[PDB]
Amino acid sequence: VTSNHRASDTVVCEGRPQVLNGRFMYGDVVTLTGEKVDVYVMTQPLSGKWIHFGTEVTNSSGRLTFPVPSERALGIGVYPVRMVVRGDHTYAECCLTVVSRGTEAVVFSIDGSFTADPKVRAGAVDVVRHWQDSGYLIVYVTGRPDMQKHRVVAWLSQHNFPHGVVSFCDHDPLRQKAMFLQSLVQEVELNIVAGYGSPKDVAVYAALGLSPSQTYIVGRAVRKLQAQCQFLSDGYVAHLGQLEAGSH
């Protein structure tokens, strides 16, 4: 019945082609195939005024790829995006983040970093907020399908987690996470300087090229992983203290 539309938070380096993606489903029992969707960008992020950028048609799997015209390409900043289904005026929302080349970022694996509605680990929000206030782009990744974005984002907003680029899976979640982060590093030209998560994430970060100094993992240390990461045995609050007195 009710629409369950999702639009991908898109991060892109300046000057580079800007491409927005979305998927449009109802109830994903129903797939919105072959329907016109209008793409809006709030080019003045605090104005509340939407600008129609163009229109695209969803494919057989309800997906949408919309290219931002070069004449309308957005400068460095974060811009709200809304994709409206013309047929019933339902919509999805996501942010377009345009960054300067070599922008430094921090990755958090949502379930493995933040959970213990699941309860939130103590001091997690403050660590993320610390990284953002220190000048780092926040990137949230999760193995969950974007079908659940509506629930995930809400959770993130409930605990007042800082605004960041949120990325969701379709398949193997680890290959997707690894390759996605790789695409951030090579095609978006981000400088990922630290990765957070649970033990299963170590491999992923290792695949990115992150050193064990830069890989923070929750829960007491595990011997197989011994030289592959830093364990946050004492918790996020303690970790925050150890960040604040510089350790990174």
Give the interface with Ca ion as residue ranges (CB under 5 A): 155
Point out the residue whose Cβ comes nearest to Ca ion: 155
The nearer residue to Ca ion, 36 or 150, going by C-beta atoms, is 150
Please state the closest distance from residue 240 (CB atom) to Ca ion, in A. 21
Cα–Cα distance for residue pair 209/214, rounded to 1 Å: 10
The helix (H) or strand (E) run that includes residue 183 is helix 173-186
What does the block give as tokens for 41? 């960008």
The nearer residue to Ca ion, 155 or 180, going by C-beta atoms, is 155
The nearer residue to Ca ion, 50 or 155, going by C-beta atoms, is 155
Query: Which residues have a Cβ under 8 Å from the Cβ of 53 and sit 6 or more positions away?
Result: 39, 40, 41, 66, 68, 69, 72
Please state the closest distance from residue 110 (CB atom) to Ca ion, in A. 6
Residue 106 backbone phi and psi in degrees, to 5: -130, 135
Please state the closest distance from residue 111 (CB atom) to Ca ion, in A. 6
Please state the closest distance from residue 120 (CB atom) to Ca ion, in A. 9
The nearer residue to Ca ion, 155 or 231, going by C-beta atoms, is 155
| Radius of gyration for the alpha carbons in the chain, expressed in angstroms and rounded | 19
Residue 121 backbone phi and psi in degrees, to 5: -60, 145
